[PDB]
């Protein structure tokens, strides 16, 4: 295989059918002042039985595009 | 215009008339077929041979046909 990309994030909202949206925070150094800045990005993952709720810590992996703006799936729910 | 330019507008017409004939002949069949199922698969495969219908798409149609006739 090839071990497609994987991210770890926090569930932000569950208001859709069989789909969740999580937010991932990363600390990147500023290109000029060299100060580490917390930048956020929101992914859209795929859920089957609607198990995770807002405030959890999930781990998603990149797959084929299952829909528009939806190319991830939750596999490794860690904390609730 | 060129000499080679005044040959494609003449040969592509003879190709297009036959392509349209063979395309509509099987389009009408796949339309008013939805057992004589083993009669349009031949036409679909002949189109795939003539490179009209792209054997990939031809196999898509062949799979979609004999899945509801059951």
């Amino acid at each position: 295989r090839n071990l497609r990309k994987e991210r770890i994030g926090v569930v932000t909202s569950n208001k859709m059918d069989k789909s969740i949206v999580i937010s991932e925070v990363r600390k990147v150094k500023h290109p000029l002042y060299g100060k580490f800045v917390l930048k956020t990005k929101k992914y859209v993952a795929h859920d089957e039985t609607n198990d995770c709720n807002i405030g959890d810590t999930v781990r998603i992996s990149e797959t084929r595009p299952l829909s528009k703006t939806k190319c991830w799936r939750l596999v490794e729910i860690l904390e609730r | 215009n060129h000499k080679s330019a005044l040959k494609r507008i003449r040969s592509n017409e003879k190709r297009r008339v036959l392509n349209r004939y063979q395309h509509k002949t099987t389009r009408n069949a796949i339309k008013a077929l939805r057992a004589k199922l083993s009669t349009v698969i031949s036409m679909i495969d002949k189109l795939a041979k003539k490179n009209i219908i792209h054997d990939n798409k031809a196999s898509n149609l062949k799979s979609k046909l004999t899945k509801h006739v059951a």
Binding site: H30, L32, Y33, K35, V37 | -
Partner: protein, 121 residues
């Protein structure tokens, strides 16, 4: 000041407004004159400087200063403005090339011949 303040809003760099603006950022511009007259400096100089109202090819009305002595510069003449203001006439911010299409050069000039458009005797 603070690194956080700089990260939020960095240092603002100004644009350094140009000097010669009404010539479309070209070295020389052709133009037609409409009024050739004479003006006074501010102070304490005392002279009669020769200026001309030139309408450039891009639709700009400027005031050019005629260098040297000896010229025709009638009410309608094709001149070539190059730029370079003077600190005596308020408003004149351009110069006319001597030796251009229609403007005359100078006679009896021997030292600064590259300027004022004078041939070598």
């Amino acid at each position: 000041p603070t690194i956080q303040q700089l990260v939020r809003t960095g240092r603002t760099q100004i644009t350094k407004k140009s000097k010669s603006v009404a010539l479309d950022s070209c070295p020389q511009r052709r133009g037609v004159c409409t009024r050739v007259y004479t003006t006074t400096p501010k102070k304490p100089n005392s002279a009669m400087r020769k200026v001309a109202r030139v309408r450039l090819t891009n639709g700009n009305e400027v005031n050019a200063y005629i260098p040297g002595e000896g010229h025709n510069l009638q009410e309608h003449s094709i001149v070539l403005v190059r730029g370079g203001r003077v600190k005596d006439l308020p408003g004149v911010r351009y110069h006319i090339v001597r030796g251009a299409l229609d403007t005359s050069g100078v006679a009896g000039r021997t030292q600064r011949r590259s300027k004022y458009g004078a041939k070598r005797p």
